[PDB]
Short mmCIF file of C-alpha atoms and ligand atoms in Angstrom, two decimals:
data_model
loop_
_atom_site.label_atom_id
_atom_site.label_comp_id
_atom_site.label_asym_id
_atom_site.label_seq_id
_atom_site.Cartn_x
_atom_site.Cartn_y
_atom_site.Cartn_z
CA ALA P 1 21.74 -2.78 -1.45
CA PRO P 2 20.88 -5.86 -3.59
CA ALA P 3 20.68 -5.43 -7.43
CA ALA P 4 16.96 -6.42 -7.44
CA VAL P 5 14.34 -7.33 -4.82
CA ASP P 6 10.74 -8.58 -5.08
CA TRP P 7 8.84 -9.53 -1.99
CA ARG P 8 6.21 -11.30 -4.15
CA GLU P 9 8.67 -14.16 -4.45
CA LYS P 10 9.56 -14.14 -0.76
CA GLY P 11 5.83 -14.76 -0.29
CA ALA P 12 5.17 -11.47 1.56
CA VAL P 13 2.54 -10.35 -0.93
CA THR P 14 -1.20 -11.18 -0.97
CA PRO P 15 -3.00 -11.31 -4.34
CA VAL P 16 -4.09 -8.08 -6.02
CA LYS P 17 -7.38 -6.74 -4.63
CA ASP P 18 -9.99 -4.37 -6.11
CA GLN P 19 -10.94 -1.16 -4.23
CA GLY P 20 -13.88 -0.45 -6.51
CA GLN P 21 -15.54 2.92 -6.87
CA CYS P 22 -14.30 4.07 -3.44
CA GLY P 23 -11.36 6.33 -2.50
CA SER P 24 -9.81 3.86 -0.12
CA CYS P 25 -6.39 3.34 -1.75
CA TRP P 26 -4.93 4.74 1.48
CA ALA P 27 -6.54 1.75 3.23
CA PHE P 28 -5.19 -0.80 0.75
CA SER P 29 -1.65 0.52 0.85
CA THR P 30 -1.84 0.41 4.69
CA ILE P 31 -3.21 -3.16 4.90
CA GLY P 32 -0.78 -4.43 2.21
CA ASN P 33 2.15 -3.06 4.18
CA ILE P 34 0.82 -4.67 7.39
CA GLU P 35 0.24 -7.89 5.38
CA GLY P 36 3.90 -7.95 4.36
CA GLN P 37 5.43 -6.77 7.68
CA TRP P 38 3.46 -9.52 9.49
CA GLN P 39 4.54 -12.19 6.98
CA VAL P 40 8.21 -11.07 7.05
CA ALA P 41 7.82 -11.20 10.87
CA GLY P 42 7.71 -15.01 10.14
CA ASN P 43 3.95 -15.67 10.15
CA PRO P 44 1.42 -17.36 7.91
CA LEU P 45 0.85 -14.80 5.14
CA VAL P 46 -2.71 -13.62 5.67
CA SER P 47 -5.13 -11.19 3.96
CA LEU P 48 -6.16 -8.33 6.30
CA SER P 49 -9.32 -6.23 6.28
CA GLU P 50 -9.45 -2.97 4.33
CA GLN P 51 -13.15 -2.56 5.28
CA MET P 52 -11.98 -2.28 8.88
CA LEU P 53 -10.26 0.98 8.03
CA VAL P 54 -12.85 2.25 5.58
CA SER P 55 -15.78 1.95 8.04
CA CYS P 56 -14.10 2.36 11.43
CA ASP P 57 -11.22 4.86 10.95
CA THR P 58 -12.46 8.05 12.65
CA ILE P 59 -9.23 9.94 11.78
CA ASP P 60 -9.84 9.38 8.04
CA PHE P 61 -12.68 9.87 5.53
CA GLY P 62 -13.53 6.24 4.63
CA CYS P 63 -14.34 6.21 0.94
CA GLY P 64 -13.30 9.90 0.67
CA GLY P 65 -9.67 9.08 1.38
CA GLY P 66 -7.05 9.35 4.04
CA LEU P 67 -3.42 9.01 4.93
CA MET P 68 -1.55 5.75 5.57
CA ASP P 69 0.06 7.34 8.66
CA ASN P 70 -3.41 8.11 10.09
CA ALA P 71 -4.59 4.54 9.55
CA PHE P 72 -1.44 3.34 11.43
CA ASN P 73 -2.26 5.77 14.28
CA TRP P 74 -5.90 4.69 14.45
CA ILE P 75 -5.01 0.97 14.50
CA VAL P 76 -2.75 1.75 17.50
CA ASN P 77 -4.59 4.56 19.33
CA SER P 78 -8.03 3.26 18.64
CA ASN P 79 -7.79 -0.47 18.06
CA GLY P 80 -4.89 -1.52 20.32
CA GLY P 81 -2.70 -2.38 17.30
CA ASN P 82 -5.31 -4.99 16.18
CA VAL P 83 -6.11 -5.90 12.54
CA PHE P 84 -9.05 -8.14 11.50
CA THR P 85 -8.80 -10.73 8.72
CA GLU P 86 -10.23 -10.06 5.31
CA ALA P 87 -12.19 -13.37 5.83
CA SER P 88 -13.97 -12.14 8.94
CA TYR P 89 -14.48 -8.55 7.73
CA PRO P 90 -14.79 -8.77 3.93
CA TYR P 91 -14.57 -5.72 1.57
CA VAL P 92 -18.02 -4.43 0.62
CA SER P 93 -17.52 -0.72 -0.34
CA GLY P 94 -16.57 -1.86 -3.88
CA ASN P 95 -19.39 0.18 -5.46
CA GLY P 96 -18.76 3.36 -3.46
CA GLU P 97 -20.70 3.24 -0.19
CA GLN P 98 -19.77 3.08 3.44
CA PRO P 99 -21.37 0.63 5.79
CA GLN P 100 -21.36 1.35 9.51
CA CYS P 101 -18.46 0.17 11.63
CA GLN P 102 -19.03 -3.23 13.22
CA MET P 103 -16.44 -4.05 15.94
CA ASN P 104 -17.71 -7.55 16.90
CA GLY P 105 -17.82 -10.88 14.99
CA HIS P 106 -14.44 -10.51 13.25
CA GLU P 107 -11.14 -12.26 13.99
CA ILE P 108 -7.76 -10.58 14.49
CA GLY P 109 -5.22 -11.64 11.86
CA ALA P 110 -2.34 -9.30 12.68
CA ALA P 111 -1.09 -6.87 15.31
CA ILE P 112 1.11 -3.77 15.22
CA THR P 113 2.66 -1.27 17.70
CA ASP P 114 3.86 1.78 15.78
CA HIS P 115 4.64 3.15 12.33
CA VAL P 116 7.65 4.93 10.81
CA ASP P 117 8.19 7.50 8.08
CA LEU P 118 11.11 6.98 5.73
CA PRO P 119 13.33 9.57 4.00
CA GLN P 120 12.53 11.27 0.73
CA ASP P 121 15.55 9.58 -0.80
CA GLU P 122 15.51 6.66 -3.24
CA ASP P 123 18.56 4.60 -2.35
CA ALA P 124 17.52 5.00 1.25
CA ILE P 125 14.10 3.57 0.36
CA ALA P 126 15.61 0.75 -1.68
CA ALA P 127 17.67 0.03 1.46
CA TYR P 128 14.59 -0.15 3.76
CA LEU P 129 12.37 -2.00 1.22
CA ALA P 130 15.00 -4.74 0.78
CA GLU P 131 15.57 -5.17 4.52
CA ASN P 132 11.95 -4.97 5.69
CA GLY P 133 9.58 -5.76 2.81
CA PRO P 134 6.61 -3.96 1.19
CA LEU P 135 6.34 -0.25 2.00
CA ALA P 136 3.25 1.91 2.03
CA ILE P 137 3.82 4.81 -0.40
CA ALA P 138 1.82 7.59 -2.04
CA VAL P 139 1.91 8.53 -5.70
CA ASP P 140 0.72 10.81 -8.38
CA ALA P 141 -1.66 8.40 -10.12
CA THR P 142 -2.50 10.68 -13.10
CA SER P 143 -0.43 8.48 -15.46
CA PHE P 144 -1.76 5.21 -13.97
CA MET P 145 -5.04 5.87 -15.82
CA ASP P 146 -3.40 5.45 -19.25
CA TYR P 147 -1.03 2.67 -18.15
CA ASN P 148 -0.89 -0.54 -20.10
CA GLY P 149 2.38 -2.32 -19.32
CA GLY P 150 6.13 -1.90 -19.23
CA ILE P 151 8.27 0.66 -17.48
CA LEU P 152 6.86 4.13 -16.97
CA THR P 153 9.58 6.76 -17.43
CA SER P 154 7.52 9.79 -18.38
CA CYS P 155 5.07 9.80 -15.42
CA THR P 156 3.20 13.00 -14.45
CA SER P 157 4.90 13.96 -11.24
CA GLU P 158 3.15 17.08 -9.98
CA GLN P 159 0.78 16.01 -7.11
CA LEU P 160 0.33 13.14 -4.59
CA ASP P 161 -3.19 11.72 -4.95
CA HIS P 162 -2.92 7.93 -4.42
CA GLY P 163 -1.80 5.33 -1.88
CA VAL P 164 -0.08 2.16 -3.26
CA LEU P 165 2.37 -0.50 -2.18
CA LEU P 166 6.03 -0.76 -3.07
CA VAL P 167 7.08 -4.42 -3.14
CA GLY P 168 10.36 -4.51 -5.10
CA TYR P 169 12.80 -2.93 -7.55
CA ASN P 170 15.51 -3.65 -10.13
CA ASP P 171 18.74 -1.67 -10.87
CA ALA P 172 19.87 -4.28 -13.39
CA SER P 173 17.62 -3.00 -16.15
CA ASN P 174 17.71 -0.13 -18.61
CA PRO P 175 16.30 2.06 -17.03
CA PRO P 176 16.14 0.63 -13.48
CA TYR P 177 12.63 0.35 -11.94
CA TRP P 178 10.35 -0.07 -8.89
CA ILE P 179 7.68 -2.80 -8.54
CA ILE P 180 4.39 -1.28 -7.26
CA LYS P 181 1.17 -3.18 -6.35
CA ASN P 182 -2.09 -1.32 -6.99
CA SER P 183 -5.64 -1.89 -5.74
CA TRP P 184 -7.40 -1.69 -9.10
CA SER P 185 -7.67 -5.48 -9.58
CA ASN P 186 -5.47 -7.79 -11.68
CA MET P 187 -7.12 -6.53 -14.90
CA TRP P 188 -5.09 -3.35 -14.77
CA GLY P 189 -1.40 -2.87 -15.72
CA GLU P 190 0.66 -6.02 -15.42
CA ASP P 191 -1.82 -8.25 -13.52
CA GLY P 192 -2.40 -5.48 -10.95
CA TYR P 193 1.19 -4.15 -10.91
CA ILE P 194 3.03 -1.18 -12.45
CA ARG P 195 6.76 -0.62 -12.96
CA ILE P 196 8.08 2.95 -12.90
CA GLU P 197 11.59 4.33 -13.44
CA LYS P 198 13.71 4.41 -10.24
CA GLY P 199 16.03 7.42 -9.55
CA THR P 200 13.96 10.40 -10.84
CA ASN P 201 11.21 10.63 -8.21
CA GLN P 202 8.80 9.23 -10.81
CA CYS P 203 5.16 10.04 -9.92
CA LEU P 204 6.63 11.72 -6.82
CA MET P 205 7.09 8.29 -5.22
CA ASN P 206 9.71 9.13 -2.49
CA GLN P 207 7.56 11.88 -0.93
CA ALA P 208 5.33 9.98 1.54
CA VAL P 209 6.91 6.55 2.25
CA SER P 210 5.94 4.78 5.51
CA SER P 211 5.61 1.40 7.18
CA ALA P 212 3.97 -0.07 10.31
CA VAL P 213 6.07 -1.91 12.95
CA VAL P 214 5.54 -5.46 14.29
CA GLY P 215 6.54 -6.76 17.78
C1 C2W V 301 -6.99 12.24 6.22
O1 C2W V 301 -7.44 12.52 4.86
C2 C2W V 301 -6.50 13.13 4.07
C3 C2W V 301 -5.70 14.20 4.52
C4 C2W V 301 -4.77 14.78 3.66
C5 C2W V 301 -4.62 14.32 2.34
C6 C2W V 301 -5.42 13.24 1.88
C7 C2W V 301 -6.34 12.68 2.76
C8 C2W V 301 -5.34 12.71 0.59
O2 C2W V 301 -5.37 13.48 -0.36
N1 C2W V 301 -5.26 11.30 0.40
C9 C2W V 301 -5.22 10.55 -0.91
C10 C2W V 301 -6.48 9.96 -1.10
O3 C2W V 301 -7.21 9.82 -0.12
N2 C2W V 301 -6.80 9.64 -2.39
C11 C2W V 301 -8.09 9.05 -2.89
C12 C2W V 301 -7.93 7.82 -3.79
N3 C2W V 301 -7.81 6.83 -4.54
C13 C2W V 301 -9.43 9.29 -2.18
C14 C2W V 301 -9.08 10.10 -3.41
C15 C2W V 301 -4.05 9.51 -0.97
C16 C2W V 301 -2.91 10.21 -0.57
C17 C2W V 301 -2.57 11.38 -1.24
C18 C2W V 301 -1.47 12.12 -0.85
C19 C2W V 301 -0.70 11.68 0.23
C20 C2W V 301 -1.03 10.51 0.92
CL1 C2W V 301 -0.07 9.93 2.32
C21 C2W V 301 -2.15 9.78 0.51
O4 C2W V 301 0.40 12.40 0.65
C22 C2W V 301 -0.01 13.60 1.40
C23 C2W V 301 -0.43 14.76 0.44
C24 C2W V 301 -1.45 15.73 1.08
C25 C2W V 301 -2.38 14.99 2.04
O5 C2W V 301 -3.70 14.88 1.47
#
């Protein structure tokens, strides 16, 4: 594995979005992973629609939450692997509420076929992240609330409550660390991002790692 990766540089990362007062982090993590897997599949990097999932995902609970795996299933089983652009289906549940699903009028910006679950091991993950790009992961976010910058090495790691996106890492560093993109706008952490210690299962990060599949 490389000493450090960061798919933000490779241009696989859309800007930091805001999920608002709605429990749709599961939908951001999902979309962000599909954003990066589609880019890294050699396409124009494009912003995909989180509102699609929030309003239309019948396997999940919209603004009440969900699982990244179940979004991946619903996009395949229910939407023929199709994903609408942000542009054509903009995010509107920012202040907590859940508009009805509208299937028409939007434009497809990305397609998928399957998803995969990755091992609860950290070098393993580092090995998939660096070969494939941003990975949908779930975290204990308890210590994200008080986060203000730098490398978190004393994270509460007792329960998975939050979907986020893993975009890079760095072993050359003391301690080594992961780069994670959040959905709490660029006014939080380090312009939207948080760095946590790598190699201790910080915030239980290796527990629920997944990614969609393109082509
Ligand atoms: C289909 O709806 C479900 C079903 C089971 C759920 C969860 C949602 C769940 O608790 N999801 C977390 C979540 O939705 N967090 C919110 C935020 N921000 C809405 C509160 C975000 C989340 C939390 C934990 C997690 C995953 Cl993959 C996602 O790993 C699985 C741990 C137990 C599964 O908990």
